[PDB]
Amino acid sequence: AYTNSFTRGVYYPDKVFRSSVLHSTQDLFLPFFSNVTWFHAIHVSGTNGTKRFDNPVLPFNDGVYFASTEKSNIIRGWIFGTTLDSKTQSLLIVNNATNVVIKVCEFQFCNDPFLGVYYHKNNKSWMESEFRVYSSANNCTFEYVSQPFLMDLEGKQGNFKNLREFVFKNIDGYFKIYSKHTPINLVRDLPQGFSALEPLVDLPIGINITRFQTLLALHRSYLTPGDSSSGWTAGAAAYYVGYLQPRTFLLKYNENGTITDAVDCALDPLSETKCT
């Protein structure tokens, strides 16, 4: 299934501050009104059983725009790399309940890797204790650790609130990260509206990444490499992925230097006029 990613995917093209000016630049962006592929998580159901837990590997292409609405923070992180198998370095980003760790190691990835928080019956607590991205790792080039943070560990299903968007691109071998998080509690699941993403982190790794996979997580379930989506599954969650393309855009900087709007130049003849 596909959904309309109307406006989203715009981010500050550069570090430079600009104000009250319309500047045109060319980078890899998500074309307006492009289809995005919707991935889903379904809880076990009746005999038919809708239940889905979608963690396939997807192509890295030029760059990926990733957005998710999570009932609970089922989605722990992503994997980037060509093989996603050892004997090659691969980017691995996972957030345990405590913090975020980014690591390049030549990990021994499981066939179906995932993470997880388990929800205990006796008490309310949600705890992450399922971490099976990889069996082992060697020759680790770079590693980073974030601060502690709190997220939804427990299994819950729906796209009630948190809306998180990210842009992953490579610039001169650079791995760039952009993000914007806005709650869409009232807001529609993958809403229509415009928001700009700003760069969080710089990863100088220089990994050539062909493909990436998203890692869903729920500690209610145990993990072994070779786990073929068996066992219990996490609450409902949906994430989207789109592909960036070289295109021109006209960005509108407000007084603040915030990007209020944008025009997809190529989108249509009307949009082209706006460009000139």
Partner: antibody, heavy 124, light 108 residues
């Protein structure tokens, strides 16, 4: 016969609590989300609360958030709604309805089956 | 959030005529709209889902269409049974919301 029978309505003073229950039959209860919707007579129909099939994920309307808790006992084939700090405003007829899966998203079917309703009155 | 506003709030039509109730969302719900029929004191019954899919067992007289933000439930040949209040709802995003309700009455 898919059926939903609600019980527990009554007269309640402000501050009080009640728990309504809805016994379901005719389908695999464990596999579906259940919701509680209320119709307060002068006003209209309002969606109160929802629970995921697993029973973990639970959502509520803002007015009720601290006050109401929805829960279910699959073995029991029963759904419950415990209410607290009742206000005069909560007076309404409460219906238990079987909801669609949110996952369906743009193609949501809405609530297929509904119960007769339990009337709760909050007055001094 | 999203507000659904139905119109007209009330209408009276003769038997056999075509009735059209509209519902307008504050913002794009997409296809996420359903319609319900409610009789006095009785619980609501689901007429349509996904804007135009007839629920099982519902009479063919009822149909629902929609595009954009605006959706319409039409009743091709009004019958006396049809007396009721009809509500639209949008499942698109939380919280779930119902329209005000349109009361239909048989004109005599």
């Amino acid at each position: 016969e898919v059926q939903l029978v609600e019980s527990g309505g009554g007269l309640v003073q402000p501050g009080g609590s009640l728990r309504l229950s809805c016994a379901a039959s005719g389908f695999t209860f464990s596999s579906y989300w259940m919701n509680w919707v209320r119709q307060a007579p002068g006003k209209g129909l309002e969606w109160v609360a929802n629970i995921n099939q697993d029973g973990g994920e639970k959502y509520y309307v803002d007015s009720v958030r601290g006050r109401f808790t929805i829960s279910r006992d699959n073995a029991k084939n029963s759904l419950y709604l415990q209410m607290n700090s009742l206000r005069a405003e909560d007076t309404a007829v409460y219906y238990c309805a079987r909801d669609p899966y949110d996952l369906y998203g743009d193609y949501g079917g809405t609530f297929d089956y509904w119960g007769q309703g339990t009337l709760v009155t909050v007055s001094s | 959030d999203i507000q659904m506003t139905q119109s007209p709030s009330t209408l009276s039509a003769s038997v056999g005529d075509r009735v059209t109730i509209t519902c307008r969302a504050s913002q794009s719900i997409s296809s996420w709209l359903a319609w319900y029929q409610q009789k006095p004191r009785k619980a609501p019954k689901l007429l349509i889902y996904k804007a135009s899919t007839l629920e099982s067992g519902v009479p063919s007289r009822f149909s629902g269409s929609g595009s954009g933000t605006e959706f319409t439930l039409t009743i091709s040949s009004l019958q006396p049974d049809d007396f009721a209040t009809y509500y639209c709802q949008q499942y698109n995003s939380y919280s779930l919301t119902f329209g005000g309700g349109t009361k239909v009455e048989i004109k005599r």
